[PDB]
């Protein structure tokens, strides 16, 4: 319900970041994903407990290195949204790279 809005906002901001930073590889294209992981995440606990209540995100982790180790729950719940957003936006970034080479008539 609210995770779809965050997903669409992250897709739009990541498309604008790859449009602006105009890089054309799959090895160095990660700083635009760092732009999407640091901007599209919600700030305080209201939307964080509101987005994770909606579908699209789970508690289990894909990579062990990105999991934080602290006693504050809000840092782990923010890094959860960040890691899930990077995992769900890697393939969409490569799809918009495949659409990106012949999108704008220039």
């Amino acid at each position: 319900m609210t995770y779809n809005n965050v997903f669409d906002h992250a897709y739009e901001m990541l498309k604008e970041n790859i449009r602006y930073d105009d890089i054309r590889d799959t090895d160095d294209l990660h700083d635009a994903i760092h732009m999407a992981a640091d901007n599209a995440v919600p700030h305080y606990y209201a939307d964080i407990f509101s987005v994770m209540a909606s579908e699209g995100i789970d508690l289990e982790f894909e990579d062990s290195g990105l999991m934080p180790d602290t006693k504050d729950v809000i840092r782990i719940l923010q890094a959860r949204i960040y890691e899930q957003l990077t995992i769900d936006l890697w393939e969409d970034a490569e799809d918009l790279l495949n659409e990106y080479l012949e999108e704008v008539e220039e």
Binding site: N17, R19, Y20, T26, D27, H30, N39, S64, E105, E106
Partner: protein, 1341 residues
């Protein structure tokens, strides 16, 4: 100098002290091993595609009695050439010819064949075949799949470090790993009990997985506890004593032995008291009562009166049970043993926790536990138990996993079926209890013996199995009801979904990657790359921060150096030089055998499990010629940590000092004297470099450059070479040697030199010839020189004269000051070839062809174009010039009542409103290279592409005519030789052509033989020539695949020459990058007493922080190398005799320490000395190895020969002030590099452009532009300054207003310079969005 017929021109002075037994490998065994295992067919059913064929076939699945077996997987031919299919933009794949057979059996006929069909070839599968380098092509682009590492099937262990309980208690688990299917794990409880985890679900009870083996609980507990016989016969209460079963026991009561006391209360239980009880034959004696109360009845007992429900499973005995067993009269009572005292009784506790002891209740419980909720239906539980039971299709324990399961349990067999059995889970539980005791240590997670490295063949097989089970699903669908409806040539399997699946897999996201075009050492380290990211390592059951760290198994298997500079640092480990994948899949590095007296020169390949018990000596240790160890205490190691051993306690030895580094960082001399992070940084400098035009050799190398340049495949390697016939700038042909020769295929081989075509990272590839004319070569010798290659030796960058001083500020911390002479030599002038990919849109209405004659174009731009909108080859495009004519089709506008004059002038919108031309976005300059218009079958593009067709026809004729002309010349020689015995008319042969009127009437037997042989051979050669010519003619002019939205795809290669620039992204081999401050002229730079100005000045102040002593020694050694080369150049310019330069070359190549290089002269004399003098006149190629390389004394004794001061402090002057410098500068020579980044490519700050509705995001000034990232912290910095108007521009006017940009542009251009402050058109949008609801916004002060 007789090794590969190219070292004789350029002798490398090797400083390798330690002896080498094993030579340098092919460096592509990892990429080619799985390919030669997957494609080559094995009649034995293991390790291949035939092994995957025999594991799922034959199947019928519904009452058919008709099996399908097809033993044919050998025939396969590529459809075109590799380079031609790479140019044409088509994927490079080959069909798989599989011949099938079918057997139809009658009803109730065992082993009866009534009908059969024969199929010679069934078209299925289009597999791409890799080349000898390992670059298979999709859509005209080479793709390299990165090899991975995955958790091999076996038995794993982990301690869990007290994670889920957080007190500090360990939790041992034995997670069995299959090849595919469900995973099973065991769990320890904080209350010391066992649980089962299946597919990461909740906790299962313990003994339900083991009592489902058609077993009873009493048999399980009798398998647990052993050999305790407590007997009661007429109130006896006397049992058997066990002295040897226990080492100590707290005796709380008096223990007597045959009328006398043996162990008193609180008596000694020492070795003497045990010996006095064991030496005397003591029968069964009385025990105290309280030993019984701590015991548990074991087996299923029944009384005389009562039956069941007593002593069933873990019944704690009380005072109500002793009277019952005394009334029933039990002769033998089985009680506990307290087995495994180091761990304790744990099975009886799990029996006490688990209420269920029946098998059917266990199946109902596990059937309700797998699903979230299902009612018990008496057949679902058996099906769910069979699904977890080991089978063939749903479960796999193939040869690697079965061998690991045998080695984990100390079994002696290696061959078995891929299924578990009844005793296997019992042995796994026994192994878990054995780890719980302590006999046997817990294996670490990050061993290389636990993780198996998989390559591209296993990945292709694992993806092909999904297509194969789809194929057998289609076969099971087709064989249903199709008894007489087989249709073996008609109703076969559609090969389109499996081709789409293999095209998606070889064009995947994580696995298949693009090969980086810069510095082909980067290519050969992409081909030797092992990463952990992907769908296979996506699960990560046991991972964390420890996986990214280094384990001491990483000694010689992979390298700890080569990791990328991104976030994933520590998880990509490049494979080392000498390591080799075993036949199971694990990595093995070679070790030579050491006997008692001598050292045997043979080598073995050792794995991690072998070296866990073996002893491995160090690499740097003394060894004489015979093999006797002269050192009494050789420093060695046992399990990874170095500790001093004796001379005979080791039986292995390292072959060479190269195994601890891979091929990427083996080009850096003195890796001891550089820091590890800085060596990693130097590897990240060497991973990217554009090729240079001059390509000067590394004067300081390691000897790895020739091996990389001969093993990467970027240069042409001459096979069966010999006398060279003809070499030009595009072709190399070699006359065949008389040593090896094919009967009928003696001929010549053609080497087509690839010219300047576009690569992946916009780089040029070129192949310069090495042998000019008339020189014998060897099979293995090089002939072409690729990008960054100097005469078959790898030359990534170029070296220059370096002055170590602080300058006037132009080198701050690590900046670089260069000279103007480097610009004068056109040095590292990069050549960037980009792609012009034209598009011709096809709509619902209008024509499809894009033609010439586009209006609204000036005649100055139309003069450089030929017909049909293509420019001439050699015309320069600068910015907005037209390379191809873009054409919108004539649809969408012919049914318009308006704009008739616009359709008369500039009809159907042939150009845009206001846009640039479609060549390159603006800011460039450069000429065209090659046009690649490829046509469709029936498209009529002759007027645009007739030139390339005629040119490629002439190239094909010039390539494939010379071999048959040499064969025809040999035919004419045999004509001139066959008529010697009869009718000598050689003057008539030389006078009249055409075989002297075609072999006139000589002696009849020889005449008939000559006419028959010449007619037969001439007609067959003419027919074969016409067949090859017509076949290649049908190959060239044809059609290829294309998207239906476009008609043609025009590819124009556009070369751009980029001059010198102050950014330059310049670096070295030791992790020292820097930028150009200012282009410094020649006359104002320091120079020595001979007047040679320096070429580059870097900053020594970074030296004590970047820890680069190897840079200093490379500098001081390159100084001596170029000094020897300059003395050779002076002897050449003085034109001395051969014998005077000969003694100098001998003294330069023998004087030193024991570097064991037995190269010498008097092999070739009076020739080829001037050639090597002209080769090495620009500098001496001294090869310095990494670990057994140069010392300081070797550098001093070699540098005294070049008439240079020993400390390196060469006194310099000044070019700006002329004052003699104090603190004499150690000048020398360093091998510099230019990276991929360019300062003119990083250009930004677009201007006010049209077609922008919000935030100036579409159509700015760039290639593809977008306006954002002012920042979220810079706004707060402007708040911290107190900037209001700059922040006001950051809010509305400069940032987020359309009318405000026009007003500000009018203010700047008209000269008003009025800001007009306020809240323009953003707060108005806020008011329109707030007042849309039932609440409004008023207006007050």
């Amino acid at each position: 100098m007789v090794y590969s017929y190219t070292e004789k021109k350029r002798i490398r002075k090797d400083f390798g002290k330690r002896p080498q037994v094993l030579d340098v490998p092919y460096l592509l065994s990892i990429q080619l091993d799985s390919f030669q295992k997957f494609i080559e067919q094995d009649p034995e059913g293991q390790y291949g595609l035939e092994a995957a064929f025999r594991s799922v076939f034959p199947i019928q699945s519904y009452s058919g009695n008709s099996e399908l077996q097809y033993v044919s997987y050998r025939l396969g031919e590529p459809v075109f050439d590799v380079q031609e299919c790479q140019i044409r933009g088509v994927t490079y794949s080959a069909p798989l010819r599989v011949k099938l057979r079918l057997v139809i059996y009658e009803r109730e006929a065992p082993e009866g064949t009534v009908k059969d069909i024969k199929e010679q070839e069934v078209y299925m599968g289009e597999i791409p075949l890799m080349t000898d380098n390992g670059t298979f092509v999709i859509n005209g682009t080479e793709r390299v799949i990165v090899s991975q590492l995955h958790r091999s099937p076996g038995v794993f262990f982990d301690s869990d470090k007290g994670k889920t309980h957080s007190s500090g208690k360990v939790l041992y688990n034995a997670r069995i790993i299959p090849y595919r299917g469900s995973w099973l794990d065991f769990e320890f409880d904080p209350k010391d009990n066992l649980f089962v985890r299946i597919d990461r679900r909740r906790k299962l009870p313990a003994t339900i997985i083991l009592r489902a083996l058609n077993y009873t609980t009493e048999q399980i507990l009798d398998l647990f506890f052993e050999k305790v016989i407590f007997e009661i016969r007429d109130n006896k209460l006397q049992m058997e004593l066990v002295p040897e079963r226990l080492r100590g026991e707290t005796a709380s009561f008096d223990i007597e032995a045959n009328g006398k006391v043996y162990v008193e209360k609180g008596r000694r239980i020492t070795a003497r008291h045990i010996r006095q009880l064991e030496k005397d034959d003591v029968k069964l004696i009385e025990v105290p009562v309280e030993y019984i109360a701590g015991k548990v009845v074991a087996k299923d007992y029944i009384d005389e009166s009562t039956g069941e429900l007593i002593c069933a499973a873990n019944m704690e005995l009380s005072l109500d049970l002793l009277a019952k067993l005394s009334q029933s009269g039990h002769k033998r009572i089985e009680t506990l043993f307290t087995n495994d005292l180091d761990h304790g009784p744990y099975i009886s506790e799990t029996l006490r926790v688990d209420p269920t002891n029946d098998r059917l209740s266990a199946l109902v419980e596990i059937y309700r536990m797998m699903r979230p909720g299902e009612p018990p239906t008496r057949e679902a539980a058996e099906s769910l138990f069979e699904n977890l039971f080991f089978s063939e299709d749903r479960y796999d324990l193939s040869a690697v996993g079965r061998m690991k399961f045998n080695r984990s349990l100390l079994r002696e067999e290696i061959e078995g079926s891929g299924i578990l059995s009844k005793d296997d889970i019992i042995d796994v539980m026994k192994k878990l209890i054995d780890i719980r005791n302590g006999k046997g240590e817990v294996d670490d997670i990050d061993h290389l013996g636990n993780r198996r490295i998989r390559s591209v063949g296993e990945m292709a097989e694992n993806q092909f199995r999904v297509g194969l089970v789809r194929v057998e699903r289609a076969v099971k669908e087709r064989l249903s009801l199709g008894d007489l409806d087989t249709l073996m040539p008609q109703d076969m399997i559609n090969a389109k979904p499996i081709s789409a699946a293999v095209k998606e897999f070889f064009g995947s996201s994580q696995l298949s990657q693009f090969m980086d075009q810069n510095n082909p050492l980067s290519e050969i380290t992409h081909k030797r790359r092992i990463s952990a990211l992907g769908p296979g390592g996506l699960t990560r059951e046991r991972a964390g921060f420890e996986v990214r760290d280094v384990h001491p198994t990483h000694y010689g298997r992979v390298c700890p150096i080569e990791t990328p500079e991104g976030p994933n640092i520590g998880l990509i480990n490049s494979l080392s030089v000498y390591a080799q994948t075993n036949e199971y899949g694990f990595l093995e590095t070679p070790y030579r055998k050491v006997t008692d007296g001598v050292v045997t020169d043979e080598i073995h390949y050792l794995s991690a499990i072998e070296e866990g018990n073996y002893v491995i000596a160090q690499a740097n240790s003394n060894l004489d010629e015979e093999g006797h160890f002269v050192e009494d205490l050789v420093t060695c190691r046992s399990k990874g940590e170095s500790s001093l051993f004796s001379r005979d306690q080791v039986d292995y030895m390292d072959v060479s000092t190269q195994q601890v580094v891979s091929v990427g960082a083996s080009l850096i001399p003195f890796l001891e004297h550089d820091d590890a992070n800085r060596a990693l940084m130097g590897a990240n400098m060497q991973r990217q470099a554009v090729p240079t035009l001059r390509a000067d050799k590394p004067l300081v190398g390691t000897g790895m450059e020739r091996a990389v340049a001969v093993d990467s495949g970027v240069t042409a390697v001459a096979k069966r070479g010999g006398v060279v016939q003809y070499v030009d700038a595009s072709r190399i042909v070699i006359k065949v040697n008389e040593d090896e020769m094919y009967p009928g295929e003696a001929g010549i081989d053609i080497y087509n030199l690839t010219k300047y075509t576009r690569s992946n990272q916009n780089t040029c590839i070129n192949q310069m010839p090495c042998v000019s004319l008339g020189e014998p070569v060897e099979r293995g010798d090089v002939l072409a020189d690729g990008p960054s290659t100097d005469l078959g030796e790898l030359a990534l960058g170029q070296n220059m004269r370096v002055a170590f001083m602080p300058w006037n500020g132009y080198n701050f911390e690590d900046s670089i000051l260069v000279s103007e002479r480097v610009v004068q030599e056109d040095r590292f002038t990069t050549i960037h070839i980009q792609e012009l990919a034209c598009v011709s849109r096809d709509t619902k209405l209008g024509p499809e062809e894009i033609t010439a004659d586009i209006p609204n174009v000036g005649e100055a731009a139309l003069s450089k174009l030929d017909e049909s909108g293509i420019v001439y080859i050699g015309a320069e495009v600068t910015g907005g010039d037209i390379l191809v004519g873009k054409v919108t089709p004539k649809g969408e506008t012919q049914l318009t009542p308006e704009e008739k004059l616009l359709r008369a002038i500039f009809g159907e919108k042939a150009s845009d409103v206001k846009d640039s031309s479609l060549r390159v976005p603006n800011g460039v300059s450069g000429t065209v290279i090659d046009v690649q218009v490829f046509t469709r079958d029936g498209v009529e593009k002759d007027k645009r592409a007739l030139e390339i067709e005629e040119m490629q026809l002439k190239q094909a004729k010039k390539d494939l005519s010379e071999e048959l002309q040499i064969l025809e010349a040999g035919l004419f020689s045999r004509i001139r030789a066959v008529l010697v015995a009869g009718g000598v008319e050689a003057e008539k042969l030389d006078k009249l052509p055409r075989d002297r009127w075609l072999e006139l009437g000589l002696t009849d037997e020889e005449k008939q033989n000559q006419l028959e042989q010449l007619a037969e051979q001439y007609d067959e050669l003419k027919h074969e020539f016409e067949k090859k010519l017509e076949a290649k003619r049908r190959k060239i002019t044809q059609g290829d695949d294309l998207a239906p939205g476009v008609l043609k795809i025009v590819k124009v290669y556009l070369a751009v020459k980029r001059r010198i620039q102050p950014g330059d992204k310049m670096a070295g081999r030791h992790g020292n990058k820097g930028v150009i401050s200012k282009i410094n002229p020649i006359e104002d730079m320091p120079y020595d007493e001979n007047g040679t100005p320096v070429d580059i000045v870097l900053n020594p102040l970074g030296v004590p922080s970047r820890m680069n002593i190897g840079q200093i020694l490379e500098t001081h050694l390159g100084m001596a190398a170029k000094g020897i080369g300059d003395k050779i150049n002076a002897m050449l310019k003085q034109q001395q005799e051969v014998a005077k330069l000969r003694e100098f070359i001998q003294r330069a190549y023998d004087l030193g320490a024991d570097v064991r290089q037995k190269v010498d002269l008097s092999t070739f004399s009076d020739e080829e000395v001037m050639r090597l003098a002209e080769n090495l006149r620009k500098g001496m190629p001294i090869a310095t190895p990494v670990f057994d390389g140069a010392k300081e004394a070797e550098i001093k004794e070699l540098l005294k020969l070049g008439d240079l001061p020993t400390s390196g402090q060469i006194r310099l002057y000044d070019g700006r002030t002329g004052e003699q410098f104090e603190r004499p500068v150690t000048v020398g020579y360093m091998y510099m590099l230019k990276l991929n980044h360019l300062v003119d490519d990083k250009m930004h700050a677009r201007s006010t452009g049209s077609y922008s509705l919000v935030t100036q995001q579409p159509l700015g000034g760039k290639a593809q532009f977008g306006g954002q990232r002012f920042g979220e912290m810079e706004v707060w910095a402007l708040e911290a300054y107190g900037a209001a108007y700059t922040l006001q521009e950051m809010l509305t006017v400069k940032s987020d207003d359309v009318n405000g940009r026009t007003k500000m542009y009018k203010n700047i251009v008209d000269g008003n310079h009025q800001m007009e402050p306020g809240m323009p058109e953003s707060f108005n949008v806020l008011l329109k969005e707030i007042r849309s609801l039932g609440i409004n916004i008023e207006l007050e002060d």
